Short mmCIF file of C-alpha atoms and ligand atoms in Angstrom, two decimals:
data_model
loop_
_atom_site.label_atom_id
_atom_site.label_comp_id
_atom_site.label_asym_id
_atom_site.label_seq_id
_atom_site.Cartn_x
_atom_site.Cartn_y
_atom_site.Cartn_z
CA UNK A 24 0.00 0.00 0.00
CA UNK A 25 1.51 3.35 -1.03
CA UNK A 26 0.42 5.09 2.19
CA UNK A 27 2.12 2.63 4.56
CA UNK A 28 5.45 4.27 3.70
CA UNK A 29 4.46 7.88 4.42
CA UNK A 30 4.15 7.10 8.13
CA UNK A 31 7.58 5.47 8.04
CA UNK A 32 8.95 8.87 7.00
CA UNK A 33 7.52 10.56 10.10
CA UNK A 34 8.50 7.60 12.29
CA UNK A 35 12.20 8.43 12.68
CA UNK A 36 11.34 12.04 13.55
CA UNK A 37 9.00 10.70 16.22
CA UNK A 38 11.46 8.20 17.68
CA UNK A 39 14.26 10.75 17.91
CA UNK A 40 12.50 13.94 19.00
CA UNK A 41 9.06 13.16 20.46
CA UNK A 42 7.98 11.71 23.78
CA UNK A 43 6.83 8.11 23.49
CA UNK A 44 3.41 8.57 25.07
CA UNK A 45 2.84 11.70 22.98
CA UNK A 46 3.50 9.54 19.92
CA UNK A 47 1.20 6.89 21.41
CA UNK A 48 -1.61 9.38 21.99
CA UNK A 49 -1.06 10.75 18.48
CA UNK A 50 -1.25 7.23 17.03
CA UNK A 51 -4.59 6.75 18.78
CA UNK A 52 -5.81 10.09 17.44
CA UNK A 53 -5.14 9.14 13.82
CA UNK A 54 -7.01 5.87 14.31
CA UNK A 55 -9.90 7.63 16.03
CA UNK A 56 -10.43 9.52 12.75
CA UNK A 57 -9.66 6.61 10.40
CA UNK A 58 -6.57 8.20 8.82
CA UNK A 59 -4.37 5.10 9.09
CA UNK A 60 -3.48 2.94 6.07
CA UNK A 61 -5.39 -0.22 5.23
CA UNK A 62 -4.40 -3.79 4.34
CA UNK A 63 -7.41 -5.28 2.53
CA UNK A 64 -5.57 -8.31 1.11
CA UNK A 65 -6.75 -11.85 1.70
CA UNK A 66 -4.64 -13.63 4.30
CA UNK A 67 -2.82 -16.88 3.62
CA UNK A 68 -5.18 -19.75 4.40
CA UNK A 69 -2.03 -21.68 5.37
CA UNK A 70 -1.52 -19.29 8.31
CA UNK A 71 -5.09 -19.13 9.64
CA UNK A 72 -4.83 -20.35 13.24
CA UNK A 73 -7.24 -21.10 16.08
CA UNK A 74 -7.41 -21.33 19.86
CA UNK A 75 -10.14 -23.93 20.51
CA UNK A 76 -13.27 -22.56 18.75
CA UNK A 77 -11.68 -19.09 18.45
CA UNK A 78 -10.64 -18.92 14.78
CA UNK A 79 -7.97 -16.34 13.93
CA UNK A 80 -7.63 -15.47 10.25
CA UNK A 81 -3.91 -14.94 10.86
CA UNK A 82 -1.66 -15.45 13.88
CA UNK A 83 -0.92 -11.78 14.63
CA UNK A 84 -2.80 -9.35 16.84
CA UNK A 85 -1.94 -6.26 18.87
CA UNK A 86 -0.97 -6.77 22.50
CA UNK A 87 -2.72 -5.25 25.50
CA UNK A 88 -1.76 -1.82 26.80
CA UNK A 89 -1.89 -0.26 23.33
CA UNK A 90 -5.58 0.67 23.01
CA UNK A 91 -6.35 0.57 26.72
CA UNK A 92 -9.84 2.01 26.10
CA UNK A 93 -11.11 0.75 22.73
CA UNK A 94 -11.16 4.23 21.20
CA UNK A 95 -9.03 3.03 18.30
CA UNK A 96 -10.22 -0.48 17.48
CA UNK A 97 -11.40 -0.14 13.87
CA UNK A 98 -8.28 1.53 12.49
CA UNK A 99 -5.71 -0.67 14.24
CA UNK A 100 -7.43 -3.89 13.18
CA UNK A 101 -7.69 -2.52 9.64
CA UNK A 102 -3.88 -2.22 9.48
CA UNK A 103 -3.74 -5.99 8.96
CA UNK A 104 -4.09 -7.63 12.36
CA UNK A 105 -6.36 -10.62 12.93
CA UNK A 106 -7.29 -9.62 16.49
CA UNK A 107 -6.66 -7.09 19.25
CA UNK A 108 -6.45 -7.33 23.04
CA UNK A 109 -7.70 -4.09 24.60
CA UNK A 110 -6.99 -3.03 28.17
CA UNK A 111 -5.93 -3.79 30.65
CA UNK A 112 -9.08 -2.29 32.15
CA UNK A 113 -10.26 -1.73 35.72
CA UNK A 114 -13.78 -1.06 37.04
CA UNK A 115 -13.19 2.66 37.62
CA UNK A 116 -10.95 4.97 35.67
CA UNK A 117 -7.40 5.70 36.78
CA UNK A 118 -4.81 8.29 35.81
CA UNK A 119 -1.91 5.93 36.48
CA UNK A 120 1.51 6.85 37.80
CA UNK A 121 3.06 10.24 37.13
CA UNK A 122 4.41 11.23 33.72
CA UNK A 123 6.80 10.88 32.00
CA UNK A 124 6.30 7.11 32.42
CA UNK A 125 7.33 5.66 29.03
CA UNK A 126 10.88 5.72 27.63
CA UNK A 127 12.17 4.22 24.38
CA UNK A 128 15.76 3.21 23.63
CA UNK A 129 15.98 3.07 19.84
CA UNK A 130 19.43 1.48 19.76
CA UNK A 131 18.44 -1.65 21.69
CA UNK A 132 14.84 -1.73 20.38
CA UNK A 133 13.62 -1.69 23.98
CA UNK A 134 10.94 0.08 26.00
CA UNK A 135 10.37 0.72 29.70
CA UNK A 136 7.00 1.79 31.08
CA UNK A 137 5.58 2.67 34.49
CA UNK A 138 2.09 3.42 33.22
CA UNK A 139 0.13 1.61 35.88
CA UNK A 140 -3.47 0.93 34.89
CA UNK A 141 -4.51 4.25 33.39
CA UNK A 142 -7.85 3.73 31.64
CA UNK A 143 -11.21 5.42 31.17
CA UNK A 144 -12.94 2.83 33.37
CA UNK A 145 -14.90 -0.32 32.65
CA UNK A 146 -18.25 1.37 32.03
CA UNK A 147 -17.13 3.98 29.51
CA UNK A 148 -14.82 1.51 27.77
CA UNK A 149 -17.79 -0.84 27.44
CA UNK A 150 -19.74 1.83 25.56
CA UNK A 151 -16.76 2.31 23.23
CA UNK A 152 -16.82 -1.42 22.50
CA UNK A 153 -20.58 -1.40 21.89
CA UNK A 154 -20.04 1.34 19.30
CA UNK A 155 -17.39 -0.85 17.67
CA UNK A 156 -19.50 -4.01 17.55
CA UNK A 157 -22.30 -2.04 15.89
CA UNK A 158 -19.84 -0.79 13.27
CA UNK A 159 -18.40 -4.30 12.90
CA UNK A 160 -21.80 -5.69 11.86
CA UNK A 161 -21.84 -2.98 9.15
CA UNK A 162 -18.24 -3.21 7.86
CA UNK A 163 -16.93 -6.21 5.91
CA UNK A 164 -13.28 -5.51 6.74
CA UNK A 165 -14.18 -6.26 10.38
CA UNK A 166 -16.68 -9.10 9.97
CA UNK A 167 -14.20 -11.87 10.83
CA UNK A 168 -11.89 -9.96 13.21
CA UNK A 169 -11.73 -10.75 16.92
CA UNK A 170 -11.49 -8.48 19.95
CA UNK A 171 -10.35 -9.73 23.34
CA UNK A 172 -10.33 -7.74 26.58
CA UNK A 173 -7.55 -7.78 29.16
CA UNK A 174 -8.91 -7.16 32.66
CA UNK A 175 -7.21 -6.24 35.92
CA UNK A 176 -7.64 -4.36 39.19
CA UNK A 177 -7.40 -0.79 40.42
CA UNK A 178 -4.41 -0.02 42.62
CA UNK A 179 -6.72 0.47 45.62
CA UNK A 180 -8.75 -2.68 44.90
CA UNK A 181 -8.74 -4.90 47.98
CA UNK A 182 -9.95 -8.17 46.44
CA UNK A 183 -8.95 -8.77 42.83
CA UNK A 184 -11.92 -11.10 42.32
CA UNK A 185 -14.40 -8.30 43.04
CA UNK A 186 -12.94 -6.30 40.15
CA UNK A 187 -12.95 -9.37 37.90
CA UNK A 188 -16.67 -9.80 38.59
CA UNK A 189 -17.72 -6.24 37.75
CA UNK A 190 -15.89 -6.14 34.43
CA UNK A 191 -16.96 -9.63 33.35
CA UNK A 192 -20.56 -8.89 34.31
CA UNK A 193 -20.41 -5.56 32.45
CA UNK A 194 -18.45 -6.32 29.26
CA UNK A 195 -18.39 -10.11 29.03
CA UNK A 196 -21.21 -10.39 26.52
CA UNK A 197 -19.39 -8.11 24.04
CA UNK A 198 -15.94 -9.73 24.30
CA UNK A 199 -14.53 -12.67 22.35
CA UNK A 200 -12.14 -13.66 25.14
CA UNK A 201 -10.92 -12.43 28.51
CA UNK A 202 -7.23 -12.11 29.40
CA UNK A 203 -6.39 -12.40 33.10
CA UNK A 204 -3.70 -9.83 33.94
CA UNK A 205 -2.03 -10.94 37.18
CA UNK A 206 1.42 -10.05 35.86
CA UNK A 207 1.87 -6.28 35.47
CA UNK A 208 5.11 -5.29 37.28
CA UNK A 209 4.04 -1.65 37.71
CA UNK A 210 1.15 -2.34 40.13
CA UNK A 211 2.26 -3.01 43.73
CA UNK A 212 1.76 -6.56 44.95
CA UNK A 213 -0.06 -7.49 41.74
CA UNK A 214 2.40 -10.28 40.88
CA UNK A 215 1.75 -11.85 44.29
CA UNK A 216 -1.65 -12.83 42.85
CA UNK A 217 0.09 -15.51 40.74
CA UNK A 218 0.47 -17.70 43.84
CA UNK A 219 -1.16 -21.00 42.95
CA UNK A 220 -3.96 -20.87 45.50
CA UNK A 221 -5.43 -17.50 44.58
CA UNK A 222 -4.71 -17.79 40.85
CA UNK A 223 -6.70 -21.02 40.96
CA UNK A 224 -9.53 -19.15 42.67
CA UNK A 225 -9.01 -16.31 40.18
CA UNK A 226 -9.36 -18.60 37.16
CA UNK A 227 -12.36 -20.50 38.52
CA UNK A 228 -14.13 -17.23 39.33
CA UNK A 229 -13.44 -15.78 35.88
CA UNK A 230 -14.74 -18.95 34.22
CA UNK A 231 -17.73 -18.99 36.57
CA UNK A 232 -18.62 -15.32 36.08
CA UNK A 233 -18.45 -15.76 32.30
CA UNK A 234 -20.51 -18.95 32.61
CA UNK A 235 -23.18 -17.16 34.66
CA UNK A 236 -24.09 -14.59 31.99
CA UNK A 237 -25.66 -17.26 29.77
CA UNK A 238 -28.21 -18.53 32.28
CA UNK A 239 -30.49 -15.54 32.92
CA UNK A 240 -31.55 -14.30 29.51
CA UNK A 241 -34.74 -14.60 27.50
CA UNK A 242 -32.90 -14.01 24.21
CA UNK A 243 -31.13 -16.88 22.50
CA UNK A 244 -27.34 -17.08 22.43
CA UNK A 245 -27.14 -15.35 19.04
CA UNK A 246 -28.45 -12.07 20.44
CA UNK A 247 -26.79 -12.50 23.85
CA UNK A 248 -23.21 -12.28 22.57
CA UNK A 249 -22.83 -9.04 20.62
CA UNK A 250 -19.30 -10.05 19.68
CA UNK A 251 -17.66 -11.79 16.72
CA UNK A 252 -18.02 -15.43 17.77
CA UNK A 253 -21.58 -15.27 19.13
CA UNK A 254 -20.10 -17.55 21.79
CA UNK A 255 -18.88 -17.38 25.37
CA UNK A 256 -15.56 -15.49 25.69
CA UNK A 257 -12.61 -17.79 26.23
CA UNK A 258 -10.39 -17.22 29.27
CA UNK A 259 -6.65 -16.64 28.93
CA UNK A 260 -4.13 -15.92 31.69
CA UNK A 261 -1.31 -13.38 31.36
CA UNK A 262 1.94 -14.46 33.01
CA UNK A 263 5.06 -12.57 34.10
CA UNK A 264 8.57 -13.82 33.26
CA UNK A 265 10.07 -12.94 36.66
CA UNK A 266 9.14 -16.18 38.41
CA UNK A 267 11.01 -19.27 39.54
CA UNK A 268 10.07 -22.63 38.07
CA UNK A 269 8.47 -23.84 41.31
CA UNK A 270 5.91 -21.07 40.86
CA UNK A 271 5.54 -21.94 37.17
CA UNK A 272 4.84 -25.64 37.71
CA UNK A 273 2.35 -24.77 40.45
CA UNK A 274 0.54 -22.49 38.01
CA UNK A 275 0.74 -25.10 35.25
CA UNK A 276 -0.75 -27.76 37.53
CA UNK A 277 -3.52 -25.31 38.46
CA UNK A 278 -4.55 -24.09 35.02
CA UNK A 279 -4.82 -27.70 33.83
CA UNK A 280 -7.06 -28.65 36.76
CA UNK A 281 -9.28 -25.56 36.39
CA UNK A 282 -9.57 -25.90 32.59
CA UNK A 283 -8.26 -22.52 31.49
CA UNK A 284 -8.90 -21.82 27.82
CA UNK A 285 -5.40 -20.47 27.22
CA UNK A 286 -2.41 -18.62 28.58
CA UNK A 287 -0.73 -15.50 27.20
CA UNK A 288 3.04 -16.01 27.54
CA UNK A 289 4.59 -13.69 28.39
CA UNK A 290 4.73 -10.14 29.85
CA UNK A 291 7.31 -7.47 30.69
CA UNK A 292 10.22 -7.98 33.10
CA UNK A 293 11.95 -6.05 35.87
CA UNK A 294 15.12 -8.17 35.87
CA UNK A 295 16.79 -6.70 32.77
CA UNK A 296 19.79 -4.59 33.83
CA UNK A 297 21.63 -4.35 30.48
CA UNK A 298 20.10 -1.07 29.24
CA UNK A 299 22.14 2.03 30.05
CA UNK A 300 19.48 4.61 29.15
CA UNK A 301 16.90 3.18 31.58
CA UNK A 302 19.10 3.39 34.68
CA UNK A 303 17.23 4.43 37.84
CA UNK A 304 13.90 4.29 35.97
CA UNK A 305 11.03 2.23 37.38
CA UNK A 306 8.73 -0.06 35.42
CA UNK A 307 8.71 -3.13 33.23
CA UNK A 308 10.69 -3.40 30.00
CA UNK A 309 9.38 -4.55 26.62
CA UNK A 310 10.89 -5.19 23.22
CA UNK A 311 13.87 -7.01 21.75
CA UNK A 312 15.64 -7.54 25.07
CA UNK A 313 12.64 -9.68 26.10
CA UNK A 314 12.38 -11.76 22.91
CA UNK A 315 14.71 -14.59 23.92
CA UNK A 316 13.61 -14.64 27.56
CA UNK A 317 9.93 -14.98 26.66
CA UNK A 318 10.38 -17.72 24.07
CA UNK A 319 12.03 -19.93 26.68
CA UNK A 320 9.19 -19.26 29.14
CA UNK A 321 6.79 -20.50 26.45
CA UNK A 322 8.78 -23.72 26.13
CA UNK A 323 8.71 -24.19 29.91
CA UNK A 324 4.98 -23.55 30.32
CA UNK A 325 4.22 -25.33 27.04
CA UNK A 326 5.96 -28.35 28.56
CA UNK A 327 4.69 -27.80 32.10
CA UNK A 328 1.15 -27.86 30.65
CA UNK A 329 1.87 -31.04 28.63
CA UNK A 330 0.64 -29.16 25.54
CA UNK A 331 -2.93 -29.26 26.90
CA UNK A 332 -3.38 -25.47 27.23
CA UNK A 333 -2.91 -23.20 24.17
CA UNK A 334 -0.44 -20.32 24.29
CA UNK A 335 -0.53 -16.72 23.05
CA UNK A 336 3.00 -15.50 22.33
CA UNK A 337 3.87 -11.96 23.44
CA UNK A 338 7.34 -10.51 23.87
CA UNK A 339 10.02 -9.29 21.50
CA UNK A 340 8.39 -10.28 18.20
CA UNK A 341 9.81 -8.24 15.30
CA UNK A 342 10.46 -10.67 12.44
CA UNK A 343 8.67 -13.62 10.90
CA UNK A 344 11.35 -15.93 12.28
CA UNK A 345 10.97 -14.36 15.73
CA UNK A 346 7.33 -15.44 15.55
CA UNK A 347 8.15 -18.89 14.16
CA UNK A 348 10.65 -19.50 16.96
CA UNK A 349 7.77 -18.83 19.35
CA UNK A 350 5.35 -20.82 17.19
CA UNK A 351 7.69 -23.81 17.06
CA UNK A 352 8.06 -23.42 20.83
CA UNK A 353 4.32 -23.99 21.27
CA UNK A 354 2.51 -20.71 20.63
CA UNK A 355 -0.65 -20.72 18.54
CA UNK A 356 -0.83 -16.92 18.10
CA UNK A 357 1.45 -13.92 18.51
CA UNK A 358 0.96 -10.36 19.77
CA UNK A 359 3.13 -7.39 18.81
CA UNK A 360 3.79 -4.13 20.65
CA UNK A 361 7.34 -2.79 20.37
CA UNK A 362 7.30 -3.80 16.71
CA UNK A 363 4.59 -1.24 15.98
CA UNK A 364 6.62 1.24 18.02
CA UNK A 365 9.78 0.89 15.95
CA UNK A 366 8.39 -0.24 12.56
CA UNK A 367 5.08 1.64 12.35
CA UNK A 368 2.38 0.89 9.81
CA UNK A 369 4.33 -1.78 7.89
CA UNK A 370 4.41 -3.95 11.03
CA UNK A 371 1.60 -6.30 10.00
CA UNK A 372 2.37 -6.37 6.27
CA UNK A 373 6.03 -7.03 7.07
CA UNK A 374 5.66 -9.78 9.67
CA UNK A 375 2.95 -11.53 7.64
CA UNK A 376 5.00 -11.51 4.43
CA UNK A 377 8.08 -12.70 6.33
CA UNK A 378 6.25 -15.54 8.06
CA UNK A 379 4.56 -16.85 4.91
CA UNK A 380 7.89 -16.98 3.07
CA UNK A 381 9.54 -18.88 5.92
CA UNK A 382 6.70 -21.40 6.23
CA UNK A 383 7.08 -22.04 2.50
CA UNK A 384 10.86 -22.47 2.73
CA UNK A 385 10.93 -24.64 5.85
CA UNK A 386 8.61 -27.21 4.26
CA UNK A 387 5.37 -26.83 6.21
CA UNK A 388 1.87 -27.45 4.90
CA UNK A 389 0.26 -24.97 7.32
CA UNK A 390 1.02 -23.11 10.53
CA UNK A 391 -0.48 -25.76 12.82
CA UNK A 392 2.14 -28.25 11.58
CA UNK A 393 4.81 -25.94 13.04
CA UNK A 394 3.29 -25.84 16.54
CA UNK A 395 5.83 -27.41 18.86
CA UNK A 396 7.88 -28.94 16.04
CA UNK A 397 11.03 -27.98 17.99
C1 FMN B 401 3.45 1.25 27.58
C2 FMN B 401 3.10 -0.19 27.80
C3 FMN B 401 1.86 -0.49 28.36
C4 FMN B 401 1.49 -1.81 28.58
N1 FMN B 401 0.27 -2.08 29.14
C5 FMN B 401 -0.11 -3.38 29.36
C6 FMN B 401 -1.35 -3.66 29.92
O1 FMN B 401 -2.10 -2.73 30.22
N2 FMN B 401 -1.73 -4.96 30.15
C7 FMN B 401 -0.88 -5.99 29.81
O2 FMN B 401 -1.22 -7.15 30.01
N3 FMN B 401 0.36 -5.73 29.25
C8 FMN B 401 0.74 -4.42 29.02
N4 FMN B 401 1.97 -4.15 28.47
C9 FMN B 401 2.89 -5.28 28.11
C10 FMN B 401 2.73 -5.60 26.63
O3 FMN B 401 1.38 -5.91 26.37
C11 FMN B 401 3.60 -6.78 26.20
O4 FMN B 401 3.31 -7.89 27.02
C12 FMN B 401 5.08 -6.42 26.31
O5 FMN B 401 5.25 -5.07 25.92
C13 FMN B 401 5.94 -7.30 25.42
O6 FMN B 401 5.64 -7.00 24.08
P1 FMN B 401 6.82 -6.69 23.02
O7 FMN B 401 8.09 -7.38 23.45
O8 FMN B 401 6.41 -7.16 21.64
O9 FMN B 401 7.03 -5.20 23.00
C14 FMN B 401 2.35 -2.84 28.24
C15 FMN B 401 3.59 -2.55 27.68
C16 FMN B 401 3.96 -1.23 27.45
C17 FMN B 401 5.31 -0.96 26.85
C1 LIG B 402 2.67 3.53 18.44
C2 LIG B 402 3.74 4.09 19.40
C3 LIG B 402 3.55 3.89 20.89
N1 LIG B 402 4.52 4.40 21.83
C4 LIG B 402 4.31 4.19 23.26
C5 LIG B 402 3.44 3.29 24.14
C6 LIG B 402 4.92 2.97 23.96
C7 LIG B 402 5.71 5.12 21.33
O1 LIG B 402 6.51 5.53 22.10
C8 LIG B 402 5.92 5.33 19.79
N2 LIG B 402 6.92 5.94 19.08
N3 LIG B 402 6.59 5.84 17.73
C9 LIG B 402 7.40 6.37 16.62
C10 LIG B 402 5.44 5.19 17.59
C11 LIG B 402 4.75 4.85 16.24
C12 LIG B 402 4.29 6.11 15.46
C13 LIG B 402 3.53 7.09 16.08
C14 LIG B 402 3.15 8.19 15.30
C15 LIG B 402 3.52 8.25 13.96
C16 LIG B 402 3.10 9.45 13.10
F1 LIG B 402 1.74 9.44 12.98
F2 LIG B 402 3.51 10.61 13.69
F3 LIG B 402 3.67 9.33 11.86
N4 LIG B 402 4.24 7.28 13.41
C17 LIG B 402 4.63 6.23 14.11
C18 LIG B 402 4.98 4.84 18.88
O1 OG6 B 403 1.20 -5.75 32.26
C1 OG6 B 403 1.76 -4.67 32.24
C2 OG6 B 403 1.17 -3.39 32.55
C3 OG6 B 403 1.91 -2.27 32.49
C4 OG6 B 403 1.40 -0.86 32.79
O2 OG6 B 403 2.02 -0.25 33.68
O3 OG6 B 403 0.43 -0.49 32.12
N1 OG6 B 403 3.22 -2.32 32.14
C5 OG6 B 403 3.89 -3.47 31.83
O4 OG6 B 403 5.06 -3.50 31.52
N2 OG6 B 403 3.11 -4.59 31.90
#
């Protein structure tokens, strides 16, 4: 598309001279007004992937934390992504930690963020998603695209489950899947919720709350779910990389026994100390410096779960091979974040071209044949 490249011109200017979040807000503004490029091409039927009954037309979506409020869904999905994970959201709106709270290092293709959970709140974000679903039923470029919702807790929330209830009971019928965020490093004591006992209780409650919306309705299931699948939203868990294996195997044993629908592996880390520009700066780091670390976590959990729980790759994906390495490790789908930051509009068209070519060269009939081939 000719107009993909114009935004690559501005991109270097932005990376070198403009504050990251200002660029991020700008990005969202362009999408709000549908001034982003489009990728209307048919996707390779050899790359169409699925997570249980959730059928992704291609294995690439946009990770959570990008459109934390669903004010930019149409445009981002129209860039060429098969799905998007909005959020993470909390019941009430938050302003997050103080700015500046996002810092890019172009040289290492790395990011550090101390955003917290700044969002417009569950209620208002739900209205934004309703607007989208009503446009989706009227736009053919969106008819097959999927929208998941990452959910979390407010800093002052006492019981995480209470916040999981409100959001599920408010937005569950419009979402295609729920992502359980118990892994953000920028919320105090949030990663202590990954202890097996409570995470078990967390998963069961999420599944239960989603299961409870179906019972009390007079309308059939078709008109209950105003989403893409017309089906109950699947439940995925978001995991942090900064854990020991004892914690990982505990989690793995739990999510098998509680029948989680999936697990997003992985999230940002606080243990990276090989970035000079981020010294004395709080938050979790994203990008290339997390690529290798995450892929190994996938292998671990993919093995700790005996391949019985699907995975959603997330961390350091920039190239088609980067994705394949994570696909061959056990991931069914991949999410990108830093890639959009450093590559811009050509992110989807680049990583989809690259992956198709590699699948062809490596001798694979389809993507599923590559799952766990390592
Ligand atoms: C500014 C920023 C905000 C983020 N917000 C969230 C979030 O709200 N919820 C979440 O689960 N992950 C969040 N993340 C983590 C990303 O979704 C992703 O897991 C991580 O950046 C790794 O992706 P990457 O290596 O491709 O950049 C955020 C990351 C950044 C940099
Ligand atoms: C998308 C994005 C997000 N974030 C933060 C959350 C981490 C950044 O820091 C970003 N920096 N850049 C360069 C981008 C992409 C971008 C923005 C605007 C424009 C143009 F419209 F001006 F051309 N082009 C490209 C960033
Ligand atoms: O999961 C998350 C959430 C955030 C955030 O502060 O919004 N930051 C991260 O690095 N990971």
